Design a protein around this ligand. Structure first.
Ligand SMILES: *[C@@H]1O[C@H](CO)[C@@H](O[C@@H]2O[C@H](CO)[C@@H](O)[C@H](O)[C@H]2NC(C)=O)[C@H](O)[C@H]1NC(C)=O
Ligand SMILES: *[C@@H]1O[C@H](CO)[C@@H](O[C@@H]2O[C@H](CO)[C@@H](O)[C@H](O)[C@H]2NC(C)=O)[C@H](O)[C@H]1NC(C)=O
Ligand SMILES: *[C@@H]1O[C@H](CO)[C@@H](O[C@@H]2O[C@H](CO)[C@@H](O)[C@H](O)[C@H]2NC(C)=O)[C@H](O)[C@H]1NC(C)=O
Ligand SMILES: *[C@@H]1O[C@H](CO)[C@@H](O)[C@H](O)[C@H]1NC(C)=O
Ligand SMILES: *[C@@H]1O[C@H](CO)[C@@H](O)[C@H](O)[C@H]1NC(C)=O
Ligand SMILES: *[C@@H]1O[C@H](CO)[C@@H](O)[C@H](O)[C@H]1NC(C)=O
Ligand SMILES: *[C@@H]1O[C@H](CO)[C@@H](O)[C@H](O)[C@H]1NC(C)=O
Ligand SMILES: *[C@@H]1O[C@H](CO)[C@@H](O)[C@H](O)[C@H]1NC(C)=O
Ligand SMILES: *[C@@H]1O[C@H](CO)[C@@H](O)[C@H](O)[C@H]1NC(C)=O
Lengths: 341, 341, 341
């Protein structure tokens, strides 16, 4: 365009999910956030990962909720976990001593691992023993000085005989309480479409038990209790990135779902979603300054019933993306009009 | 302002709801979206309209929900239907063969047509027969390769005798299930203010059964079952316009609630809501460029309990409307300062 | 920077919560909005205040909900009350004649006043009498020509014996109905963490009964009925300000949580939240124009389960704050580049 000029825009991503500042992300792989937290057997991240720089999820992961059901506030949980830099996966309710008189080792084929029927690892499918499902009243007091992510579930069996078998009551209930949180779940029994060869459901629920707060579970049946929980360490700059790009042990300053960015420029256009010390996104292509003469992630953050939000958010993000872009162009269009003197 | 100048702003709307690209809108008239979908008798659009370019609703339509009650996620449904370019109204559950042993032809005065008591046309008010309301288990499998909008309802009668009469049970339930969607409704019996001379209620519910998914209804009473559903064809550019302006068989490129726009200009100010190839809205009035010398609809998108959203959305839309406007003015204010050379 | 210049930015707040246009705010003090509306005894604003220019709340007020429980749509109520310029606190259900055969004067230590156990003042804790809790069916018809804010509550006692004592039924219910509003509450009985030395809960509910609409309460127990309600007078410019700054009987044109603003300038940076005829916020510090040569409140508007909203709103507000700021700077940066001629 002119003899001397400087480009400000970076359009080249290394096409890989590098390290960030020398810390490594968490690759869920086939697994989704729901399976990871719940401990879907196919994930194997449980024992091995507790820290990262960012989380990596694939566009359409299939290994999430193995036993069909509704994961309440799934997207709110995603937004919670975006800011989690690390955590501690601890056995809030030890399987061995917490449930002496309840048949742990409830298992389903819908969650099979290596061919054998199994179940989530961070949860527990309680069932009666010796013909009893005695009322349970287990409690946990968050004394870890970090907010504790607790998971649990309620089994909505397909028929009354199944419930009578698992729990030996027709009219069971699940009560979960804390200092603020109070809720009661009754199982809904009904035949349903046979997802993953299973005709029942499990409703998955969660809450962030704050330090000092005490959470109580009461139940005469239908509880998928927690075996492990998570003590969360919040962190800025981290976040969740949806992508299927490969990784090497490259290190970078910025990261984006298509690839990392390792360049001094202020701007870029590969993708607005970004993590770390990164250039700022624009839609443009031609940011040249003459020197001579002649944010949050997106995509799965909202569910069916929230399409307003998405639209609104689509209206907002996209708006700003345009807005600043224009200004940026204008700024150079001004500056070139000036620095041509 | 100067000898030579070009105006960029269009402030003249033809005051009519023309055709768009030669396709005709859907004029609900007195009827609202709720009555249209539910099939409020006063609408008469059912047999006759299945396609359009945009939907037209009046500010305060009175012919919507004839039998009083809460239409769940009404606004979410509006946002769903904004993107519907057309659909197919089909008899998911034929009245004649789907309910052989249940008294169809339940009717109320609150939905009267031509003086005779009647009922919604896209719904069915089941009632017992021969002293029985046998449990029903009807199912539908979406094999139409398009997402299917299903409607239904639950009758909350004013008193226990009314329920015992209609359904011959005091403790009825309604279970609606799909691959994800699972829900259970119990009728709430109570005397209430006598809206449209009716002391009971009907809670209206809906869902988008995706292709291949199977929806099951179970009930021992209190079901207002569907007679017709809708297979949706999504479409960009379409949308919902709230207005009372008249129509002629004029054709236009753009449309707005006050009137259409047929002009080459890039900008305008008649209304931000617009459909089709349209000039872009601003608040301004004086966009002149010298050549010489000296989005989504709005208004009813949110309910009572969501006034944050509206405020937020009001904060956003109005913001951008201002923002760009300024820039536009600035752009000309700059350009005139330049093109005066 | 240059010999002649004018500053446009105001960075000095008087550090006090003055009057606005000569009208005085409402200082809740220790009390929060919830306690104020509910009538937490420690507030004493009830008899004495019904009008203001704005509301003042402290960052972490401790005197709100005295009897533990969930205040439904608390934040939506805050947003409702932001636009309330005044109201009329009237005894919708007179304690003396509305509940002849129900033991008013239910009291708890969790709401103690001056050492004596007491209870909210705008609510009523009904309890049985002479061994009966006869079904009640009290009603109110809004004939005040202003929307009426109604409050009520449901006692979820810690154990079945407590409920049997207060209400002499194990399976109570609370039905609240209006022309649109219909709802039913069943008490959930469970031992819980002993907040404010209380092991039960009260779920607080509200609604805006519009003029002409009739609200009906039905109950066989567990009702914390209303004693007073509020007829609301909407008003622009008013709002809610969260702060702990002191007050004098100073008068001002604008107000902000850190302090008032009394200055002619168009801009400022002390705080974006503002009330009244105020300069417009920016982040900047150096707005000088040469003449020579060389919105809504924020912070508590959303709850736990809504962190998307907050993020979104944080994304929006902060965005605009930046955006306009830039433009403003640009505008002067342009103008100085021009007015230096
Ligand atoms: C985990 O995902 C795998 C697939 O990624 C599931 O295994 C089977 O995958 C094939 C395709 O490779 C499907 O056709 C099968 O239907 C899958 N199995 C079943 C039983 O349907 C596996 O089921 C998933 N398991 C969990 C726990 O997520
Ligand atoms: C449809 O709306 C019409 C009015 O547009 C309703 O008919 C009556 O309208 C008059 C005013 O013209 C009202 O005073 C009456 O109260 C209305 N009827 C009743 C029974 O109140 C009609 O009821 C509506 N019907 C439906 C099914 O929407
Ligand atoms: C109102 O708030 C006061 C505190 O501002 C509460 O009174 C006690 O305050 C001290 C601290 O000054 C705490 O250590 C005590 O725990 C408080 N009392 C109790 C019983 O815990 C008072 O309880 C509050 N009351 C209401 C109705 O809000
Ligand atoms: C699922 O995970 C397994 C094990 O890592 C892998 O072999 C497979 O490729 C993954 N699924 C897909 C679609 O790649
Ligand atoms: C569990 O059951 C055994 C059965 O003998 C009993 O001895 C024991 O006390 C029970 N423990 C708990 C914690 O319920
Ligand atoms: C309602 O529809 C009827 C029939 O089209 C019409 O006569 C009437 O004018 C409509 N209502 C109003 C207020 O115009
Ligand atoms: C309906 O009832 C009739 C009564 O004789 C019975 O013959 C028939 O089998 C029933 N059909 C269904 C579908 O319930
Ligand atoms: C609570 O209110 C009382 C009475 O006005 C006051 O003495 C006390 O200082 C307030 N609390 C705090 C923390 O200031
Ligand atoms: C209240 O109870 C008394 C008991 O004698 C009875 O006389 C009176 O009719 C009752 N009133 C109401 C309103 O229930």
């Amino acid at each position: 365009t002119v003899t001397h000029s400087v480009n400000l825009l970076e359009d080249s991503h290394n096409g890989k999910l590098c390290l960030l500042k020398g810390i490594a992300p968490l690759q869920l792989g086939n697994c989704s956030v729901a399976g990871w937290i719940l401990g879907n057997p196919e994930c194997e991240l449980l024992i091995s990962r507790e820290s990262w720089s960012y989380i990596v999820e694939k566009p359409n992961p299939e290994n999430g909720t193995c036993y069909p059901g509704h994961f309440a506030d799934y997207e709110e949980l995603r937004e919670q976990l975006s800011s989690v830099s690390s955590f501690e996966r601890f056995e809030i309710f030890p399987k061995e001593s917490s449930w002496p008189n309840h048949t742990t080792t409830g298992v389903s084929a819908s969650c099979s691992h290596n061919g054998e029927s199994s179940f989530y690892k961070n949860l527990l499918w309680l069932t009666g023993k010796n013909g009893l499902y005695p009322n349970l009243s287990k409690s946990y007091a968050n004394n870890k000085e970090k907010e504790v992510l607790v998971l649990w579930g309620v089994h909505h069996p397909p028929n009354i005989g199944d419930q009578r078998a698992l729990y030996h009551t027709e009219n069971a209930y699940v009560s979960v309480v804390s200092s603020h949180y109070s809720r009661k779940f009754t199982p809904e029994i009904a035949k349903r479409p046979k997802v993953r060869d299973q005709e029942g459901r499990i409703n998955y629920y969660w809450t962030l038990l704050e330090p000092g707060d005490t959470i109580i579970f009461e139940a005469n049946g239908n509880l998928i209790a927690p075996r492990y929980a998570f003590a969360l360490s919040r962190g800025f700059g981290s976040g969740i990135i949806n992508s299927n790009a490969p990784m090497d042990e490259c290190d970078a300053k910025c990261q984006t779902p298509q690839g990392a960015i390792n360049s001094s420029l202020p701007f870029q256009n590969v993708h607005p979603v970004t993590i770390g010390e990164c250039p700022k996104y624009v839609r443009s292509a031609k940011l040249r300054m003459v020197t001579g003469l002649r944010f949050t992630a997106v995509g799965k953050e909202f569910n069916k019933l929230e399409r307003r939000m998405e639209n609104l958010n689509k209206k907002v993000d996209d708006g700003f993306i345009d807005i600043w872009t224009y200004n940026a162009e204008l700024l150079v269009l001004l500056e070139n009009e000036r620095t041509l003197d």
